[PDB]
Specification:
Elements lengths: L9 H16 L5 H14 L4 H22 L3
């Protein structure tokens, strides 16, 4: 397999689910101003338990899969 979905922060998972809808509604906003606004929708949407818990899942499928990813010496 290739590089597995590395584990990250919850606010990040949502950042990926809104990265496309973020640059669209935004004027090609810079990556530095993309996080300042991404923090408003993140806490203005529903909650974090969605992504946060989701990160754990990648964790299990990440420690076990990375091995396969690292077994390509």
């Amino acid at each position: 397999s290739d590089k597995p979905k590395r584990p990250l922060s919850a606010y990040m998972l949502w950042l990926n689910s809104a990265r496309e809808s973020i640059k669209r509604e935004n004027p090609g906003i810079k990556v530095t101003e993309v996080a300042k606004r991404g923090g408003e929708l993140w806490r203005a949407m529903k909650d974090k338990s969605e992504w946060e818990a989701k990160a754990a899942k990648a964790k299990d499928d990440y420690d076990r899969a990375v091995k396969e990813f690292e077994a390509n010496g």
